[PDB]
């Protein structure tokens, strides 16, 4: 613990909306300090989204204006992508960082495969 709940794969409709669920059970004494979503590009994951103390940041150009991350429910940081393109198909990683009762930080991440259905 803590453990992210992320489906092994998700299929979305071409040009529609898709949700990549990423949730966890909030632990007492654990303070969420960072959320990242990454897309896999060969051997390296590339950050597409960051939520830190200044709010939300969409990084990689391919994702501007159509990427939203849930924020209303604690422990739900699911990624919503709108107007799904064929080339959005890839493995995506949800990554959450916490501060712990022992002053340390803990990171967890989990991978999902996004498939696009014509």
């Amino acid at each position, epitope marked *: *613990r803590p*453990i992210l709940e*992320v489906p*092994e794969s998700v299929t979305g409709p071409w040009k529609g909306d898709v949700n990549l669920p990423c949730t966890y059970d909030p632990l007492q004494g654990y303070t969420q300090v960072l959320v990242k979503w*990454l897309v*896999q590009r*060969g*051997s*390296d*994951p590339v950050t597409i989204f960051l939520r830190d103390s200044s709010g939300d940041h969409i990084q990689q150009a391919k994702y501007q204006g159509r990427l939203h991350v849930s924020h209303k429910v604690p422990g739900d940081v699911s990624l919503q992508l709108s107007t799904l393109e064929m080339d959005d198909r890839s*493995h995506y*990683t949800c*990554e959450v960082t916490w501060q712990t009762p022992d002053g340390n930080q803990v*990171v*967890r*991440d*989990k*991978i*999902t*495969e996004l498939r696009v259905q014509k």
Partner: nanobody
Amino acid sequence: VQLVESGGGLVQAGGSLRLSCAASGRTFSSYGMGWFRQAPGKEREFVAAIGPFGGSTYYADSVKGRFTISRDNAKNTVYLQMNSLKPEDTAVYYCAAGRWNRYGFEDQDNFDYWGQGTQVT
């Protein structure tokens, strides 16, 4: 669907084993793989892990330098090359698979599939 280890046995101290875990069911190239060990009457401890995609490797302090982990994606197999075997390495060794990427590879709750284990003495 199934993970099957192999390669365990009695080995003279300072020797070498090559442990192997054969995975069946998915493209495990997208799964992080780990090795865990549990000595008799002692708790399950992390030994080694290798992440999905790129071959990023991680080791427990105890086995660092002596142990190495590798993966043959085409064969769906992960190997644990055990060299310079101190006697404290006597334990059952288990392979495990999870969908972590670069973090959480020592947390046993982070692994969805487990092997039966293989004894090393």
